Amino acid sequence: DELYRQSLEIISRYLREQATGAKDTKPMGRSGATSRKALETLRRVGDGVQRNHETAFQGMLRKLDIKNEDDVKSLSRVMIHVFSDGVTNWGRIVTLISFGAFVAKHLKTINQESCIEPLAESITDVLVRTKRDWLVKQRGWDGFVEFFHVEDLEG
Numbered sequence: 550d551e552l553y554r555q556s557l558e559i560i561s562r563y564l565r566e567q568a569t570g571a572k573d574t575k576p577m578g579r580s581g582a583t584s585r586k587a588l589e590t591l592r593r594v595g596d597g598v599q600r601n602h603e604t605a606f607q608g609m610l611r612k613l614d615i616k617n618e619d620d621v622k623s624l625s626r627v628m629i630h631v632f633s634d635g636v637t638n639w640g641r642i643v644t645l646i647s648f649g650a651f652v653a654k655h656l657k658t659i660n661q662e663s664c665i666e667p668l669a670e671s672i673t674d675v676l677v678r679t680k681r682d683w684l685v686k687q688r689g690w691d692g693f694v695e696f697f698h699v700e701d702l703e704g
């Protein structure tokens with residue numbers, strides 16, 4: 550399942566890099582050129598989302614009250630409720646992943662870094678297993694990179 554594997558790599562890398570502040574130097578697996586560009590795109594776009602929606606992000610983080618492994622496990626149901634049960638567009642997928650990064654950083658602050666990879670798996674499961682048809686029609690991560698590509702300015 551190439552789409553699942555690629556999605557997990559991108560999402561896991563972004564969440565870990567957001568939590569630790571360090572770039573992972575290891576090569577990507579299959580489709581590395583696209584996965585690298587997808588991760589680079591998340592750095593640009595996801596970082597903006599967390600700031601543009603800081604107040605709402607903080608508000609939802611407080612409502613969720615994430616203290617431990619069991620709380621983190623319970624997020625799958627909430628993601629299905631809020632993300633899956635709505636229109637699909639790339640913006641909503643970026644909000645899903647960006648709020649994931651926001652939660653990952655919270656897990657770093659409460660010294661529960663071990664839950665970051667399980668969290669990335671849960672986000673990936675919700676995205677890929679509930680939106681595969683849409684992702685395939687939109688050209689997967691190649692389409693993500695194309696959608697957010699910005700042309701160089703003249704001069």
Ligand SMILES: C[C@@H]1[C@@H](C)C/C=C/[C@H](O)[C@@H]2CC[C@H]2CN2C[C@@]3(CCCc4cc(Cl)ccc43)COc3ccc(cc32)C(=O)NS1(=O)=O
Nearest residue numbers: 602605606609624627628631632641644645648649652672
């Ligand atoms: C204008 C809206 C956002 C850009 C800004 C604020 C949004 C909301 O107040 C909540 C702050 C987190 C937002 C709720 N969740 C976040 C949520 C749902 C809450 C739990 C959760 C946990 C993780 Cl690890 C990742 C995502 C999530 C599901 O993903 C979302 C995807 C799209 C939208 C909202 C999502 C989503 O579509 N949000 S929106 O209508 O575009």
